[PDB]
């Protein structure tokens, strides 16, 4: 019983808060605006069953944009290997990762 009264009357009651790529106040972009736009423009019109398999890559990029789990796992690997090399003494941090270089701009 999804009585789509909004599309029948042509009124907009709640389609504006629905996605991040909608018309935002003062044109503020969301952090995953491009990824959600790619996933929506992929998955539009082809239905859920074709959208789960034919738009899997845009959906994975958008989920990894939102949650950043692969990015945090990569940073965990880099930080853990860096701390292991500090513990093994085979690595010294550079002057630009120590606070002694007077940043760019």
């Amino acid at each position: 019983p999804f009585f789509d009264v909004q599309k029948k009357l042509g009124v907009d009651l709640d389609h504006w808060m629905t996605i991040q790529s909608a018309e935002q106040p003062h044109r503020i972009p969301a952090r995953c605006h491009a990824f959600e736009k790619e996933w929506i423009e992929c998955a539009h019109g082809i239905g859920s069953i074709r959208a789960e398999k034919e738009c899997k890559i845009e959906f994975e990029d958008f989920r990894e944009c939102l949650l950043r789990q692969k990015t945090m796992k990569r940073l965990n690997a880099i930080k853990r290997q860096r701390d292991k090399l500090i513990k093994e003494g085979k690595y010294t941090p550079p002057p630009h990762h120590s606070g002694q270089e007077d940043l760019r701009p």
Partner: protein, 70 residues
């Protein structure tokens, strides 16, 4: 008579005068003889952190003018 309350009102007024004058003089002492930078919005903090980086001495209130460019 009625002016006998004025020593107590004077002491209470000095006690109200101390915090604002104190924070004005502390903001001038802590920021190079000037007002504290008001950063309510992220653009103002962006410019303030740019000032902190371009001063070289890690202070936003050290202003670099036309003497810094060639």
């Amino acid at each position: 008579m009625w002016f006998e309350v004025l020593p107590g009102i004077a002491v209470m007024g000095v006690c109200l005068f101390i915090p604002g004058m104190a924070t004005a003089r502390i903001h001038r002492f802590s920021n190079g003889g000037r007002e504290k930078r008001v950063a309510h919005y992220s653009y103002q903090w962006y410019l303030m952190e740019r000032d902190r980086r371009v001063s070289g001495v890690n202070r936003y209130y050290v202003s670099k003018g036309l003497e810094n460019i060639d």
